RNA sequence: GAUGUCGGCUCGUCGCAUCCUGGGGCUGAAGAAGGUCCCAAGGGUUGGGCUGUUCGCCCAUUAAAGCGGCACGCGAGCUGGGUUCAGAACGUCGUGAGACAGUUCGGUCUCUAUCCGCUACGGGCGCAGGAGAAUUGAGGGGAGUUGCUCCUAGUACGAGAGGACCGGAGUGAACGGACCGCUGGUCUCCCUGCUGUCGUACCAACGGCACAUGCAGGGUAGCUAUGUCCGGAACGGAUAACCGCUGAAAGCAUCUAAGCGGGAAGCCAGCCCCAAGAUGAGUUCUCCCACUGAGGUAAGACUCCCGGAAGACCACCGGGUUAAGAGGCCAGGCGUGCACGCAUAGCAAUGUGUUCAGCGGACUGGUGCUCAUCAGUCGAGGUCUUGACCA
RNA sequence: AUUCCUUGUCGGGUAAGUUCCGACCUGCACGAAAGGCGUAACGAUCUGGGCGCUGUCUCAACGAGGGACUCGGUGAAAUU
RNA sequence: AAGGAACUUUGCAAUCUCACCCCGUAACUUCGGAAGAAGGGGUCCCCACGCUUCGCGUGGGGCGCAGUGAAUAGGCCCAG
């Protein structure tokens, strides 16, 4: 009976860069749209990274310079981003699903800062 | 499946304390265990087990340790619930210095 | 957990240095010699239990030489061990006792410790061989 | 006859006197009694008990209806018990006693859709020698002509576990009553959160 | 190895055809630009979910 | 114009001329252990050496290591060792080509199941209103095995040596079900350690690649045996061979001819699970009500969205702002095992402090920060005949 | 690599060895360039044994990935 | 995990083994070989001294479970 708390889709490295190449863009675009799932499975891990990013310390930027390879990305999360987020119990990314596409009938979504 | 709201963590912990015991506190190191043995009929026998602790491994009543032995010769391991009634108490011989919290490769 | 074909150690002098099990049983000890062992499967060898085996490499002047079909009962088992206070024992080395069919040991004395589970199964003199009950 | 609804909470390590128990933990809460099952206008001799706390608003109508009946509260479950004939409701405390065997009876984790290996055992055949077959992929379903046709009742591939299963003669250990916690000796069957009933031993000694 | 006995026949063919029937979305007109979305998704034609999302 | 053939492996199932286990009669049956015959097919029937072998021989066991059937059951299930293709060799027969009662090394096992049959699981309709929930079981399946030891009892018996029935206690084996607290497995990026090289300018710190984890060391939840817990039964009824009561035909005798009582692991019932499509469609509790000229709607569902110890899909369970459903966040658990930076110590490699540190997948509660918005679809008015009871 | 009788008889190894090694001789039907008997080295040869090591196995388990399942697009086949 | 060929026609398959340096190495032999027989040990980083070139040896010290730290990389033997 399968029962874990990760979800993959491709491989186990791809997963990562891509959640990796996802979380950078978001907080480069502040939304994007993609499809609805690879959303769902942003969603959580961009966040707990605007966490390390807030509390602003060498330590967290080292920790944030991890999965953000862009050091322009970094800076932004780090200096405007995360501090932006104060009085906020944590938790702003929100999901909106856009409708079905055409190629490949694949329902999409945007994921908004 | 069944829908009560109910914490399984105080739950189960409260019948975990009256069955939990807290022991000197070890790390590393080599450790006399008292061990009271009553295997020998009415006769309860003392018996001294002095070890390296190679494992931490659980907590709550289940909370338990390993310690490895060599008597005469030939290699023993031997684990103890925290809370053993078969177990008066333990005492460290030494502290070692020690870089991971498992010590496996002392078998090698 | 003995099986056929598994080599273990001889905790005696009777003169045989690694045998090789053959047949697990069902080890009966009491009345008045051992009995005969309830089934004809019991797939392993626990301690505490008979098995019987060849004398597979025996050092030379023995009571005992190389060849010798004999019973023998187990002493440490690598498979751990659980007690009803629930420690576990396991030793590193599997190894055993050479005995007759009265279930006294053949060998003089006994080398290394033992699983104190063999003084529950009754084994009396090989307790008392024993350098440590464990 | 006896008999009360609890959920599974979990497994724990335990001493009575010097051995060590692994214990299973059910919390057998107070359970209402909405109807009587009787000779009379029902013809069978039952009782009806609630358990899981409802929230009103979520309680259909009719339901609402059926609980006003006997006015009792909202539950999300309801079981019946037989030859069963409480008085108030019910609850462990002089329910069960320490030391009383029970029949302890659950609904089994679901293993999703297995081969025979999980399911019926079997064997398989050699990873080793030659084999396109491994793993589970059974020998033959039958013989040749006579009949041309597998057994019904066959053993093969299928939804396992979920079992409704009852376990027979688990020991109640320890009871504190208010704290509406049991402790049973062993394993009880399903997950966790999990829904059972624990009731008198059916037969023993 | 395993092919087919006989062809089937239309009647059976289509009695298998029976469960192929496709579900029409069940729509509803957006309370905004006046034209029929899709329920938890955005109106494609404003862009309003909730006061208003994408630009079209 | 093809019914693949030895042996094995996998899966079984059936007969009884029964290998074990159960009940009996007789005995050249003291007891113990047997020999034979009758009843009995519930269950059980071990692991190895040689051989392609079934068979057979031997090792070590055992309650026992039963015999056959199912196309010498089973290749659209596996093997391909054995024989019946092509090569090659030996003995051998043939002048030769070649040959065989031989032996020897080698030698392709075919893609995607239509129907029936089978294991799972939905959809529709039926079950004289529309619904929510609780249920009786008609019937049906699973299960069913056994040693050992102790008491009885050193008793009955027996010159002795020995040594019980019956009944009553324990303790295992193998098998099955559930379970993960324990013991352990594994947990493909949860923590750490390491090498080459490439990169983020450089240092320091990090990331990629070296699997489809680069290698190693641990390892939570989940899953899991070898690990743990429970089981096989007790009881009752009707029987088998069998043992008897009463008793004639036949003044005696007679278990039978009327009749009546004991008697098995077998039969029924009892145990676990399924079960009203039990179209003979059952019962109980509650809810909406007696619209409209096929349509609005009540009670109530569904669609949708968020998730689950539920799952291929469907189905099932929970939440969906009179909201703690899931994510995040906070606190703790737990894993890993002492971060970065800095300071200090040394020529340095490294060491020490700060630091039980830092980090963090699945755990346990808490919190209205995020998405469960908005809405749409569907869903009763109760056929008839008789009989009873009331106005 | 010829052996029918045949699992020939003793032995070697094995707890047990119809194969294998050694010895015998009754060679069903070895034998001297269709060569006889030997030989170090060699051999993806064939046969037996041991050590090491292992999922070959008792007895399987967890993990990964690629199919298998579901939605959108294209959409065959042997057979009948 | 415990066991280690109990699997099987057969260890088929898959492990183990693995580089370079040092030491060491049998029956038999056509004196070439057998031989990489078999075994055993070293392997990383820093510092001083020396050296016949990349480097190497010596001494001392440091770190890890482990230093051909990841990839390339013989399992072996006895009889026929
Ligand atoms: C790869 C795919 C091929 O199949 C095989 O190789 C298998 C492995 C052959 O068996 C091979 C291997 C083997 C062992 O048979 C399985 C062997 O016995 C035969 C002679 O050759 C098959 C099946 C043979 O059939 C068998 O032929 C027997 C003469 C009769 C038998 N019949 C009783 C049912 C029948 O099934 C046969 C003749 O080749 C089939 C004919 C139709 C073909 O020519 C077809 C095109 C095949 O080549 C093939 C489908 O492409
Ligand atoms: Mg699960
Ligand atoms: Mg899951
Ligand atoms: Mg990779
Ligand atoms: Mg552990
Ligand atoms: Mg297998
Ligand atoms: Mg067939
Ligand atoms: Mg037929
Ligand atoms: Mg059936
Ligand atoms: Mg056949
Ligand atoms: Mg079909
Ligand atoms: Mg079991
Ligand atoms: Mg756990
Ligand atoms: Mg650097
Ligand atoms: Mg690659
Ligand atoms: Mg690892
Ligand atoms: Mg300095
Ligand atoms: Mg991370
Ligand atoms: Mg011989
Ligand atoms: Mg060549
Ligand atoms: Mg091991
Ligand atoms: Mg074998
Ligand atoms: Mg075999
Ligand atoms: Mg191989």
Redesign the interface.
């Known amino acids: 009976h399968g029962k874990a708390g990760r979800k993959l889709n491709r491989n186990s490295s791809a997963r990562v860069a891509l959640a990796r190449a996802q979380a950078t863009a978001l907080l480069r675009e502040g939304r994007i749209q993609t499809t609805l799932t690879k959303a769902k499975e942003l969603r959580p891990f961009v966040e707990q990274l605007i966490t390390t990013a807030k509390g602003g310390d060498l330590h967290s930027r080292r920790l944030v310079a991890q999965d953000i390879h862009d050091k322009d990305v970094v800076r932004k999360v780090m200096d405007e981003v995360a501090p932006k987020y104060a009085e906020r119990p944590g938790g702003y990314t929100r999901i909106l699903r856009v409708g079905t596409r055409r190629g490949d009938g694949v329902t999409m979504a945007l994921i908004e800062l | 499946q069944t829908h009560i709201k109910i914490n399984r963590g105080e739950l189960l912990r409260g019948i975990e304390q009256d069955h939990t015991r807290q022991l000197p506190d070890f790390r590393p190191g080599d450790t006399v265990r008292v061990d009271t043995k009553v295997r020998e009929g009415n006769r309860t026998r003392s018996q001294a087990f002095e070890g390296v602790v190679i494992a931490i491994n659980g907590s709550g009543s289940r909370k338990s340790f390993t310690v490895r032995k060599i008597s005469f010769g030939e290699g023993v391991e031997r684990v103890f619930p925290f809370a053993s009634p078969l177990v008066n108490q333990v005492t460290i011989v030494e502290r070692g210095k020690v870089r991971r919290a498992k010590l496996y490769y002392l078998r090698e | 957990m003995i099986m056929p074909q598994s080599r273990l150690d001889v905790a005696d002098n009777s003169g045989a240095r690694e045998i090789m099990c053959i047949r697990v049983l069902n080890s009966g000890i009491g009345g008045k010699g051992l009995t005969t062992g309830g089934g004809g499967n019991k797939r392993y060898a626990h301690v505490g239990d008979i098995i019987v085996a060849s004398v597979k490499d025996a050092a030379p002047r023995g009571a005992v030489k190389a060849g010798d079909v004999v019973k023998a009962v187990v002493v440490r088992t690598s498979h751990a061990i659980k007690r009803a206070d629930g420690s576990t024992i396991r030793f590193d080395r599997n190894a055993a006792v050479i005995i007759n069919n009265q279930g006294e040991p053949r060998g003089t004395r006994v080398f290394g410790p033992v699983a104190r589970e063999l003084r529950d199964r009754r084994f009396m003199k090989i307790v008392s061989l024993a350098p440590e009950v464990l | 006859m006896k008999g009360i609804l609890g959920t599974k909470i979990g497994m724990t390590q335990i001493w009575k006197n010097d051995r060590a128990i692994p214990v299973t933990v059910v919390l057998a809460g107070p359970c209402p009694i909405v109807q009587r099952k009787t000779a009379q206008t029902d013809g069978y001799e039952a009782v009806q008990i609630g358990y899981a706390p409802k929230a009103e608003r979520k309680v259909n109508k009719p339901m609402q209806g059926h609980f006003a009946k006997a006015g009792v509260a909202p539950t999300r479950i309801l079981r019946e018990f037989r030859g069963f004939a409480p008085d108030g409701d019910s609850v462990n405390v002089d329910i069960f006693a320490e030391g009383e065997k029970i029949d302890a009876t659950g609904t089994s984790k679901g293993k999703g859709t297995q081969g025979v290996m999980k399911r019926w055992n079997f064997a398989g055949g050699p990873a080793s020698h030659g084999s396109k077959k491994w793993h589970r992929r059974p020998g033959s379903i039958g013989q040749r002509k006579t009949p041309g046709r597998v057994y019904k009742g066959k053993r093969m591939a299928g939804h396992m576990g979920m079992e409704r299963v009852t376990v027979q003669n688990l020991e109640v250990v320890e009871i504190r009553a208010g704290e509406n916690l049991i402790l049973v000796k062993g394993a009880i069957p399903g997950a966790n959160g999990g829904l059972v009933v624990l009731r008198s031993a059916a037969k023993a000694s | 190895h395993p092919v087919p006995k006989k062809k089937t026949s239309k009647s059976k063919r289509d009695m298998r055809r029976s469960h192929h029937a496709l579900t029409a979305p069940n729509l509803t007109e957006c309370p905004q630009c006046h034209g029929k979305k899709?329920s938890?998704?955005?109106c494609?034609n404003c862009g309003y979910?909730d006061g208003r999302?994408?630009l079209a």
């Open positions: 899709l938890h998704h955005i494609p979910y999302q994408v």
